[model samples]
Target chain A: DIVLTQSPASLTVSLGQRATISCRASKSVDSYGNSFMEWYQQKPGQPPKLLIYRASNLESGIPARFSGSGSRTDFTLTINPVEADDVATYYCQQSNEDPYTFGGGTKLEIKRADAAPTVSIFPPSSEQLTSGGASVVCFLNNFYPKDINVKWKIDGSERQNGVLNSWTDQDSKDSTYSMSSTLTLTKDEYERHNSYTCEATHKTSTSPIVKSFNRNE
Target chain B: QVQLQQPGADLVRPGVSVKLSCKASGYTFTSYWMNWVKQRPGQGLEWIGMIHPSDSETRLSQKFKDKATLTVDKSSSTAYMQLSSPTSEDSAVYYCARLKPGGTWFAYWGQGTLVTVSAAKTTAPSVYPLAPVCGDTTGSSVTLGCLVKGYFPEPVTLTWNSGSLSSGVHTFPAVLQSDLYTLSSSVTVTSSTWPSQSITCNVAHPASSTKVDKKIEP
Candidate 1:
């Protein structure tokens, strides 16, 4: 099954503000030769309806404000000048079906400039280790809101104090921010069953949320 | 607009399966694709799959993977879906939908069928909530329920909506009673933020074009 991840798990956008969600697939979704990646919307009580099918085709009757773009492994769903009724969960689903899956989700809320604090996460990175101590590092190249904190945790406990990182050059057209983090562990330590977590936290006053997974634990 | 009329809803019992069909009118038989949707009593809608009468190509929702089979005959311009190995959870309303050629979303939909389970009655009066309350923006974690009264041995569906044109969620559950059957479903939309948004619960049967929808607003 292909794993899908969404950035900015949740966002608060003011009405008429542009809101964007990113979906990344573990492997290329283009299968047998199809470039379409579909996006869906689910409100409080309704079934998931198709928003953008075949990557960018707007379903009949769909509003012109909703649009999607991207191919292969990276895709973006953008709501231009988001509307009040657009405050719902959005998902990117692939029909490539070698184990089809949906992105975790990007929840949109009404932006309250004074009521809530802004929160965000730093881009995360992973390392692959070979038997002879060879290693290749993988980093999440693009993200939004540059001011995110990165940290490593193990078994629900903080492994290293959170790190402050500098923002990379922004994408010229999208103007989205980017950052990365790393962890160094021995071969045995990397191979042993253990939990490792890479978390990105916004600088807001809200609680910091973390994404953790076991390393063959 | 082209319309589809379906009937023969409300079948209950254990182990016995049900077959539903959508009769199409208003368009040429080979002009579009006919789709089937399953909505449990109080849940979201599930796209069972779709079939093209012209070429007989079929597409199914990933979850329905192999649970439901879709068939169509261009000569009849009618689409059919059959559910086997009936269970209480399978009790839900099934609907027939129409999609434009080469199109993916359903533009037109038929009323659904309500199937209930006979043996499960007395277990508990199943309550299917029709909508998710506001402040519930968790991803695909909200659950809505529904129930069909006076109808035995039939299936139904619970459908989720965001009140927007482009997206929603749906699911189908079948329930079985000794000689009767019931179908109920719960759908949790992963994302919801608007205050006036609403979700609707609908019942589809194999014999009629009209559907009963209960709207839940947050």
Candidate 2:
């Protein structure tokens, strides 16, 4: 039996913002090049709704804003510009093996006010990579109404090939929540003298928050 | 205000069948569909089938179509799922859910009943004391281990000397193999007191509610 661990237990997302939930499988759920993951949403006194199937594909009747990504053991369910009616509990399930498993669940609450996030970027340490790649991490902390859009850009254009966003984690002591993203760069890409920037988008800021890491260019 | 109550757990031998019960309250049982689901340890929920007590109409998942039988006793407002010819792999927590009207999702659920099906054991637990390990330094404590084996039904209690000296005892959960169960526990006592104190390990088994004792000599 594969165990699914859902992070952040609960979240507060403002209406018309983004909400991100994560599901982690105890082992690889990939078989035949397809991930056997599904995401579902449930509200009180209502039956659960299937939102995402096969990890990233949207189910019929589900909105495009509700998207899923990731493979193997890590997966994410994101609702961009979350609507007022999207407040509910989100869960992830795997159908690849017998004794199928479900994530514990992440409860979503809708708020009206937006809380801005603090963006912090950490440079990659020069260590020999087993796969010849350097990993740079970006931490976005203490945000409310829980929707965030993170992007990694090289020089000026956005790069998606090696970017990974983590699920939002709520702070136990406060209403604010935190999340992180990582960018993996190949050795050649690392020394290319291109400026790598982490762009964060939240409802609180009119413009996207930008933090840059120059390659000594 | 609706409620569903079920027993906590059950233990039965393989090749035997078991009937589980779920009592429904605060709602009309005949008006909605009653569902049964299976959740093996470490696995997600698997829908077994559903029954509408009104007419005993049923809809079952293909995997469990032949394995589960859903029945109802309207007089008691109780739903029953009788699982037949069960094996070790069939052991799981079974749940009774109430399907939402005009919906496929379960909105109300009963407390799960754990059904454990295993081979029957006829042997009582035997208690044995291992050779005591002496303290390496003066006034240090000595350790002793007790091996309780060949038991049925899993639950066993271990006490050290009339349960008065259980402070230093550590007992592990019983492990079953070849139709019997085994367990181990250890206790440490000060070397200074080991010379004069007569230590005994008492093992209790549920089979006959009997207590077996093994003494450790100075």
Which candidate leads in lDDT? 2
Q: Which residue pairs does candidate 2 place in steric collision?
A: A18-A147, A100-B44
- What global local distance difference test value does model 2 have? 0.72
Each candidate: chain B TM-score: 0.53, 0.61
Q: Write the per-residue lDDT of candidate 1 for residues A1-217, one digit (tens) a residue.
A: 6778888888877666898899898888775556547787866434456788777788877997989888899988889987656757787766565234567677676543322211121111121143322111112333444456666665666765323233333333333444334343556555553565666556444665454444432
Q: Provide the lDDT at B3 for model 2.
A: 89
Candidate 1 Cα misplacement greater than 4 A, ranges: A1-12, A31-34, A43-48, A87-89, A95-217, B4-11, B37-49, B55-66, B73-76, B89-99, B103-118, B122-218
**Model 2 regions more than 4 Å off:** A1-217, B1-16, B25-33, B41-44, B97-120, B127-132, B135-147, B155-173, B185-218
Residue lDDT tens for model 1, B1-218: 68788774565567776677888888897778676767675454445666778788877778787568888756776788877777878877777867656644455667665666445443322222333322435453344434332233333333444324223222323333353433433333434433434556665542223256655444
Q: lDDT (CA) for every model shown?
A: 0.56, 0.72
True contacts kept of each: 0.01, 0.03
Candidate 2: tens digits of C-alpha lDDT, residues A1-217: 6888999898877666788899899999998888988887865433356788788887666789999999999999889997767767788877676444578878887665457875656455433234465656665666775778898888798888866555432333344556656666777777774577888989788799997767542
- The C-alpha RMSD in Å for every predicted model, in order, reads 18.2, 20.7
